[PDB]
Amino acid sequence: MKTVNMKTGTDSFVGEDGKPETKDQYPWGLRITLDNESLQRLGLNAKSLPAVGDSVSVMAMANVCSVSTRTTDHGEDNYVELQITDIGLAPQKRDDAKELKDAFYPDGEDD
Amino acid sequence: MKTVNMKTGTDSFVGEDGKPETKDQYPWGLRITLDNESLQRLGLNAKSLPAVGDSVSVMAMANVCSVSTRTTDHGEDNYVELQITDIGLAPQKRDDAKELKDAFYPDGEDD
Amino acid sequence: MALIGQTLPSLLDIYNRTDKNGRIARIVEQLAKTNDILTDAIYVPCNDGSKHKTTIRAGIPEPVWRRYNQGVQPTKTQTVPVTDTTGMLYDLGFVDKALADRSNNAAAFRVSENMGKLQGFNNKVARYSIYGNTDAEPEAFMGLAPRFNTLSTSKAASAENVFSAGGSGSTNTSIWFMSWGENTAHMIYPEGMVAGFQHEDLGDDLVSDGNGGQFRAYRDEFKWDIGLSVRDWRSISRICNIDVTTLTKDASTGADLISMMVDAYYARDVAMLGDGKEVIYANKTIHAWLHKQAMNAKNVNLTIEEYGGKKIVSFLGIPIRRVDAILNTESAVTA
Amino acid sequence: GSTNTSIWFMSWGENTAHMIYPEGMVAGFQHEDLGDDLVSDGNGGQFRAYRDEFKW
Numbered sequence: 011m012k013t014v015n016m017k018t019g020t021d022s023f024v025g026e027d028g029k030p031e032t033k034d035q036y037p038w039g040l041r042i043t044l045d046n047e048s049l050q051r052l053g054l055n056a057k058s059l060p061a062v063g064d065s066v067s068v069m070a071m072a073n074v075c076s077v078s079t080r081t082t083d084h085g086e087d088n089y090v091e092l093q094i095t096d097i098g099l100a101p102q103k104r105d106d107a108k109e110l111k112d113a114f115y116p117d118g119e120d121d
Numbered sequence: 122m123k124t125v126n127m128k129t130g131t132d133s134f135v136g137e138d139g140k141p142e143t144k145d146q147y148p149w150g151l152r153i154t155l156d157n158e159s160l161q162r163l164g165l166n167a168k169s170l171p172a173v174g175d176s177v178s179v180m181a182m183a184n185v186c187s188v189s190t191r192t193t194d195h196g197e198d199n200y201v202e203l204q205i206t207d208i209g210l211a212p213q214k215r216d217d218a219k220e221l222k223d224a225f226y227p228d229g230e231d232d
Numbered sequence: 233m234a235l236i237g238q239t240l241p242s243l244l245d246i247y248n249r250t251d252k253n254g255r256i257a258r259i260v261e262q263l264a265k266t267n268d269i270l271t272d273a274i275y276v277p278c279n280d281g282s283k284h285k286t287t288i289r290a291g292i293p294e295p296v297w298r299r300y301n302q303g304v305q306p307t308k309t310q311t312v313p314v315t316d317t318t319g320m321l322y323d324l325g326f327v328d329k330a331l332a333d334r335s336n337n338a339a340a341f342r343v344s345e346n347m348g349k350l351q352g353f354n355n356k357v358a359r360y361s362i363y364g365n366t367d368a369e370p371e372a373f374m375g376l377a378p379r380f381n382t383l384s385t386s387k388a389a390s391a392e393n394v395f396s397a398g399g400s401g402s403t404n405t406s407i408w409f410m411s412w413g414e415n416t417a418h419m420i421y422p423e424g425m426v427a428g429f430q431h432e433d434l435g436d437d438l439v440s441d442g443n444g445g446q447f448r449a450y451r452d453e454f455k456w457d458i459g460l461s462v463r464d465w466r467s468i469s470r471i472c473n474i475d476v477t478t479l480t481k482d483a484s485t486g487a488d489l490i491s492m493m494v495d496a497y498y499a500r501d502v503a504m505l506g507d508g509k510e511v512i513y514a515n516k517t518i519h520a521w522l523h524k525q526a527m528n529a530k531n532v533n534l535t536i537e538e539y540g541g542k543k544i545v546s547f548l549g550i551p552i553r554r555v556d557a558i559l560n561t562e563s564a565v566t567a
Numbered sequence: 568g569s570t571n572t573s574i575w576f577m578s579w580g581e582n583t584a585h586m587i588y589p590e591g592m593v594a595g596f597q598h599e600d601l602g603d604d605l606v607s608d609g610n611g612g613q614f615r616a617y618r619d620e621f622k623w
Contacts, residue, residue: 011319011369051366083366113368116282118317121375121462125242126234143234155247224233226243 012115018050020101020111028061028101035096037066046088047117048099053080054107062089062098074098080105085117123226129161131222133169133212139222140211148178150205157225159210160196165218167191173200173209180208196229240326249344257340266351269358270513270553275424275458278417284315286463318417318459319370322427323349326436326451338450349454350425357456358556362408371459376470379564385465391496392565393472395488403560404475405515409496409552410468413507417459427454466504469496472565479521484528493522497548510550515557519544594621 016032048060059077063070072093076086089096099112126146131139159171172186182204187197212222249258278284289311296303325345332338365372381387396404431452437445471492473479478488514522527533527541535541545551585591597619602612 116317118369121314121316121372121465123243124234125236125238125240128233131233139233141233143236145237146234147238222233 011118015114017113018111022101022105022107022109022111024106024108025104026101028099028103029097033067033095033097037094039094040091041089042091044088045116046114047085048112048114049083049085050110050112052082052107052109054105054109055080057102057104059102060086060098060112061100062092062096063100064093064095064097066095126226127224129222129224130220132220133222134219135217136215138211138213140208143208145178146205146207148205152200152203152205155199156227156229157199158196158227158229159223159225160194161221161223162193163220164191164193165220166216167218168214168216169218170213171209171223172211172213173203173207174211175203175206175208177204178206184211186211240328241331243331246331246341249341251335256337257344261344261347266355267556269354269555271358271361271555272553273416274412275418276415276461277420278315278461282317282419284417284461285313286315287311287313288464315417315461316372316459317369318419318457320455320457321370322453322455323353324451324453325349326449329432329448329450332450342450346427346454353425353454353456355556357458361460362557373460376468377564380567388499389466389468390470390565391492391499392470393488393492394566395475395478396472396563396565398563401560401562402475404473405518405557405559406473406561407471407512407514407518408469408557409510409512411507411510413509414463414467415461417461419457421457424456424458425454426456427452429453464504464506466502467500467506467510469499470565471496472563473518482521482525484525490522490525493547497550512547512550512552513555513557514552515559516554517559519554592621592623594619596620 015035056079062074064072074090078084126143133139168190170188172184174181174184176182185200292309332341362373365374376386378384378386429452432450434448435445437447481487482489523544602614604610604612
């Protein structure tokens with residue numbers, strides 16, 4: 011789980027942006043209840059951060075965000091209210107690490 | 122008849138072989154009973170000969186091969202034990218000819 | 233010139249399965265090389281639409297000695313939710329309505345297809361019932377891995393062994409045994425395989441994208457959804473064992489032995505009573521080996537006329553069945 | 568690092584003494600009244616509740 015929305019890879023090179031990728035994520039709605047997800051395999055070192063966003067098609071407002079350090083396998087949780095588009099995730103920043111990326115949708119926790 | 126496997130043409134030019142391209146004819150099996158085929162139409166000049174080989178996914182191991190001389194329209198027959206990859210055919214050789222190779226599967230024959 | 237690794241049944245199949253002196257099918261039927269497994273499990277649907285919650289608890293501390301007047305303070309027991317996920321998996325087959333009718337009658341053909349697909353299916357499901365869990369979901373088991381406790385809960389449920397190597401992952405297999413009733417959960421439809429359906433329409437053909445397509449066919453598929461439960465971390469047992477050096481040395485000798493066979497059994501009861509059945513699992517090889525080595529115990533035996541001990545299906549008694557594990561994994565045991 | 572455990576065995580009849588009144592885990596007592604608060608001192612309090620204790 012699941013196609014629509016997005017899958018890995020994205021990915022992560024020695025230096026990457028993060029605004030990509032995958033629309034459809036759709037531009038109308040609100041929300042107040044349940045879940046989301048995000049993880050993957052082999053990190054390398056230090057600085058990283060996901061994010062979100064919303065509008066129609068492009069720019070440029072709002073956030074929720076998160077931050078992590080290096081480890082292999084992780085996760086935070088679900089979103090809040092939104093304008094409506096979620097270009098998210100929007101990773102960053104440094105390191106090297108070609109490592110695949112991530113995905114989202116229902117979970118699914120550890121035993 | 123039929124798609125998967127081989128199709129014409131290659132087209133066996135001046136100076137090269139025709140090991141290309143089929144990837145893959147799969148890599149597990151053995152073979153001893155039924156038939157195959159190979160022929161085409163216009164040639165140009167002199168000695169040509171096909172062959173076959175196989176390995177695990179790439180190259181290179183044993184062979185079987187055959188020999189023929191100049192004429193238009195032909196055909197020989199089958200194969201003995203092989204692992205599985207069959208990069209064949211592998212035609213040759215010299216003079217100056219630039220047209221059309223063959224394909225394999227059921228008869229065939231004449232009337 | 234052909235380009236591709238053959239999806240769909242090329243004529244090679246229909247000519248190997250074939251039909252000579254007629255006929256209909258293969259003399260019931262074709263046989264052979266696929267291993268066998270058990271499980272053969274218990275299944276349950278789970279509230280709600282997924283997950284399954286449940287709770288367990290994390291410590292219940294602590295009363296203190298009252299000193300005649302003062303110290304008490306309210307005390308509070310806590311808990312935590314738990315249960316996990318699952319996923320579906322399936323294939324589908326295709327034929328060409330023409331070729332399956334040359335030669336005649338496809339019924340036997342398709343029946344052969346579904347039986348073979350079935351055996352491969354079960355093979356894969358048992359293959360991933362024990363390993364995995366770090367990829368694109370379903371599902372999870374291995375999560376007893378770490379060797380010692382305090383870094384996890386492991387410990388008592390792991391019983392364990394010694395040896396192997398820290399710089400060489402070769403090889404030594406492993407043995408499991410646990411009790412059913414710590415179920416396997418499924419989403420609200422029947423249990424396993426169920427396929428079991430029929431379709432006859434038109435392609436579905438040439439890809440990318442694919443400059444056309446269009447041909448008629450005769451096809452269907454087989455789906456499966458499952459998801460084990462943990463329900464409780466206990467009533468389960470792991471081992472590390474041999475390796476084949478000592479596994480051969482153990483003919484009747486005693487340096488690196490089979491003793492854990494009892495320890496694991498005794499590492500259970502609280503209770504936590506639950507519920508009705510238990511069973512021990514082997515990977516063949518260790519099965520026969522255990523038989524052959526157990527015959528020669530200088531102690532309890534003496535038999536009658538005569539050897540060699542009529543399999544093992546007891547001990548003690550809790551019947552044991554055989555599954556397919558593997559002969560190479562990793563260390564991670566006792567400490 | 569031993570750390571070695573041990574095993575025991577004795578007999579009952581070399582009893583367990585309890586102070587001239589009931590025995591074992593007793594209670595089992597409920598009532599219903601108010602708080603009370605956090606520490607120092609802490610606030611106003613007074614809110615009906617469910618109370619109980621077990622002594623030994």
